[PDB]
Amino acid sequence: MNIYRYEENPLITPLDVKPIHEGFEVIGAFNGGVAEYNGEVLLLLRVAEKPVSEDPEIVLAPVYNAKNKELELQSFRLDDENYDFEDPRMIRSKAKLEGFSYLTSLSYIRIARSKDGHHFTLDEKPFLYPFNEYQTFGIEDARVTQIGDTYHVNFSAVSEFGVADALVTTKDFENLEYQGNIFAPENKDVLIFPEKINGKYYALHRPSLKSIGNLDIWIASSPDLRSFGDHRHLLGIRPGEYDSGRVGGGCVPIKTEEGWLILYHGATEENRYVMGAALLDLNDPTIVLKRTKTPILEPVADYEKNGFFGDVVFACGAIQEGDTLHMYYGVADTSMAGCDMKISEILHQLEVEA
Amino acid sequence: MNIYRYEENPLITPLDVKPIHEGFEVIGAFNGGVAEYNGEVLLLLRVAEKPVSEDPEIVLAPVYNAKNKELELQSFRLDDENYDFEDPRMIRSKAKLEGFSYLTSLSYIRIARSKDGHHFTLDEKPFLYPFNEYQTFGIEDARVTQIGDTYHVNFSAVSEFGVADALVTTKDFENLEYQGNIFAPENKDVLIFPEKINGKYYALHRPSLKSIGNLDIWIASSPDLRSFGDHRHLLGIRPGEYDSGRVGGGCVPIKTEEGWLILYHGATEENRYVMGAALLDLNDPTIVLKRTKTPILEPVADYEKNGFFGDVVFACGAIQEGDTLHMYYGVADTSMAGCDMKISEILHQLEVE
Numbered sequence: 001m002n003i004y005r006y007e008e009n010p011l012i013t014p015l016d017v018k019p020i021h022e023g024f025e026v027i028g029a030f031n032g033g034v035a036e037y038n039g040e041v042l043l044l045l046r047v048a049e050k051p052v053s054e055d056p057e058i059v060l061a062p063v064y065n066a067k068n069k070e071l072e073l074q075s076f077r078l079d080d081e082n083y084d085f086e087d088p089r090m091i092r093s094k095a096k097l098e099g100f101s102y103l104t105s106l107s108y109i110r111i112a113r114s115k116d117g118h119h120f121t122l123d124e125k126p127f128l129y130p131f132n133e134y135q136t137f138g139i140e141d142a143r144v145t146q147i148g149d150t151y152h153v154n155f156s157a158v159s160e161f162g163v164a165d166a167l168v169t170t171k172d173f174e175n176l177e178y179q180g181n182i183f184a185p186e187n188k189d190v191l192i193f194p195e196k197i198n199g200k201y202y203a204l205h206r207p208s209l210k211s212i213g214n215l216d217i218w219i220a221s222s223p224d225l226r227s228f229g230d231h232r233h234l235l236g237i238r239p240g241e242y243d244s245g246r247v248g249g250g251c252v253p254i255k256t257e258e259g260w261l262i263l264y265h266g267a268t269e270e271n272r273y274v275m276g277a278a279l280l281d282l283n284d285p286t287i288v289l290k291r292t293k294t295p296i297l298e299p300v301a302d303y304e305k306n307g308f309f310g311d312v313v314f315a316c317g318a319i320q321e322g323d324t325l326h327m328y329y330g331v332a333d334t335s336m337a338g339c340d341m342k343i344s345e346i347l348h349q350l351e352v353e354a
Numbered sequence: 355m356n357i358y359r360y361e362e363n364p365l366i367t368p369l370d371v372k373p374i375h376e377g378f379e380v381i382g383a384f385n386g387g388v389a390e391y392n393g394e395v396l397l398l399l400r401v402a403e404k405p406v407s408e409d410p411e412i413v414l415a416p417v418y419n420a421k422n423k424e425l426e427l428q429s430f431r432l433d434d435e436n437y438d439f440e441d442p443r444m445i446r447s448k449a450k451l452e453g454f455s456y457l458t459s460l461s462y463i464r465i466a467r468s469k470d471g472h473h474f475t476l477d478e479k480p481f482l483y484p485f486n487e488y489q490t491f492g493i494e495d496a497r498v499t500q501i502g503d504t505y506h507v508n509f510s511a512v513s514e515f516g517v518a519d520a521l522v523t524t525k526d527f528e529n530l531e532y533q534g535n536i537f538a539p540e541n542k543d544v545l546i547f548p549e550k551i552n553g554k555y556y557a558l559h560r561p562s563l564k565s566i567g568n569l570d571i572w573i574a575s576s577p578d579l580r581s582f583g584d585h586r587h588l589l590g591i592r593p594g595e596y597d598s599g600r601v602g603g604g605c606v607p608i609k610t611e612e613g614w615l616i617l618y619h620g621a622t623e624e625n626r627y628v629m630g631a632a633l634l635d636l637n638d639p640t641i642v643l644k645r646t647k648t649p650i651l652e653p654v655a656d657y658e659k660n661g662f663f664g665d666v667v668f669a670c671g672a673i674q675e676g677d678t679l680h681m682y683y684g685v686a687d688t689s690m691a692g693c694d695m696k697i698s699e700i701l702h703q704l705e706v707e
């Protein structure tokens with residue numbers, strides 16, 4: 001791939017964003033959803049914030065209480081032999097390392113806007129902040145699918161009841177309509193297809209599974225973008241390849257004349273995250289036509305490396321301009337970067353590699 | 355309260371069912387879904403079959419290969435230091451005891467019918483047998499919700515992709531229409547409400563969660579009984595009680611004047627399964643009114659306590675006749691039993707507790 005990485009990268013880091021909670025620091029402004037509205041590019045940033053502890057033997061979980069509508073921090077001793085703090089994103093039971101009891105940060109969504117696609121200014125106030133019992137550990141990783149006048153903003157809703165996927169709709173990003181949890185837990189990486197397709201809407205998704213099953217991309221159909229069904233398996237992990245550990249949807253599917261172009265993220269068991277691509281049949285997007293054997297975007301620039309577990313590029317949206325794609329992506333789980341590439345060139349690598 | 359366990363219990367055991375796979379043994383006929391059709395009671399029996407090995411140091415996992423349309427057997431040594439065989443239902447990796455690599459048996463649905471509700475005759479052939487790539491480890495635990503002339507038959511579809519819940523519709527139990535996986539994995543214990551309620555269909559379900567969340571009953575709404583949404587949390591587990599380990603829907607919700615009466619199963623962390631009840635608002639069933647504090651049915655008869663997986667009662671359906679409930683339930687993951695109960699006495703127990 002001929003990738004053009006923006007000169008300004010990283011576009012937005014933690015130092016560009018001030019914390020909205022007393023005694024918290026911003027640790028991430030990343031995994032931004034992407035829309036065009038009213039002649040600007042909107043990034044729907046995930047801002048993650050962490051309480052500072054003055055006692056370094058105690059770690060704080062920032063939990064939103066839905067009854068009182070405010071944070072209520074919960075303390076855990078690093079010396080508590082019931083827990084494992086080796087993944088600094090989480091407080092884990094030693095008997096359940098595959099999960100978590102708490103996150104060490106809380107996330108919400110904040111908009112940043114650009115005339116030129118390269119220089120961003122934050123909205124003054126948060127866009128979506130935990131508002132209910134499904135979001136007590138945060139709102140994460142907003143994806144934005146526009147269909148005509150309506151923007152569909154869907155996001156991870158984390159609470160003690162699970163990680164679910166929920167939907168807000170809006171025409172102006174000011175008046176918001178909550179549509180509930182469109183996917184039951186445990187799920188994320190939900191990407192709504194940007195048009196109705198032979199009488200049905202579609203969404204990619206990604207069940208995370210306890211008993212059996214890998215971290216694989218699925219797809220569901222909907223008559224109304226409120227209720228989903230006819231769930232199918234779509235793209236699975238591949239041993240020995242860049243997506244040997246997990247896959248999930250990244251950008252909104254892109255209509256091309258060859259199929260729906262799916263820019264998805266893949267990680268190895270080592271947690272190196274890259275973007276790859278798939279092409280789905282145009283009429284029935286449950287059919288996979290092609291898939292890449294090597295990535296289209298991988299961590300190589302310094303700001304894309306030295307995530308905690310690995311180097312990460314994580315693209316959660318893109319603006320199409322003819323054959324040019326302006327791709328925005330999270331980097332190292334802390335910041336936002338931007339790049340351009342050609343759609344014709346992704347299509348060509350799909351053909352060459354299959 | 356009045357619990358009439360049938361004189362004939364267990365009604366149908368493994369001894370009454372011949373295995374359809376050669377080299378296999380029937381280890382259960384259980385957790386039957388319940389319908390009335392053409393003047394008979396139908397039980398959509400889960401029949402579980404286990405591949406037999408003559409070498410006692412070896413065990414086999416049966417897998418139906420959806421591509422080749424045939425059964426493959428994976429073998430294991432009991433002494434394989436990477437696997438755990440302590441749960442008789444599953445072959446687990448030691449690094450993943452919360453899950454399973456393989457099941458010890460393969461299930462399908464087979465119908466039995468009765469004129470009197472007590473003596474049952476099996477249809478001669480299977481009714482649903484693994485037919486796609488979502489079902490390679492079995493089809494299990496069929497539930498039946500009848501709306502108008504349409505019977506909704508939904509079930510656990512187990513494969514290498516997950517445990518999903520899939521739906522078949524029929525009007526006559528002969529011509530069948532596949533409707534896909536109506537609930538994504540990981541889920542099961544999906545109970546479709548028997549009518550449209552203020553312009554929406556509903557279903558109970560039971561997400562099974564890797565990272566956080568308990569094995570709790572949830573509910574969803576639907577415009578069409580094909581796509582589900584607006585997922586809500588509904589009934590959670592209760593530490594120190596009969597349902598401290600997990601809860602799941604049992605029977606089809608039953609419309610009463612006080613609300614929807616939900617007969618659900620509850621297990622401890624030691625996997626003793628009982629039945630309990632709850633009551634939901636009539637008009638908005640996402641609202642829970644009442645819940646029992648003690649069980650309505652517990653595994654105390656010997657066919658309930660002893661079997662392939664002991665100390666289990668697991669009701670997957672019930673026929674209403676006025677105030678009387680003819681409830682049919684799985685016992686010990688081995689057999690079927692029947693009992694009669696009174697709705698009004700379940701409702702009184704809800705009001706007392």
Ligand SMILES: OC[C@H]1O[C@H](O)[C@@H](O)[C@@H](O)[C@@H]1O
Pocket residue numbers: 089103140156158163
């Ligand atoms: O959603 C829960 C949690 O899952 C993973 O650990 C990551 O995606 C985190 O960023 C996120 O907070």
Ligand SMILES: OC[C@H]1O[C@H](O)[C@@H](O)[C@@H](O)[C@@H]1O
Pocket residue numbers: 443444457494510512517
């Ligand atoms: O659904 C897979 C598996 O899950 C549980 O262990 C039980 O319900 C088993 O009977 C079943 O075979």
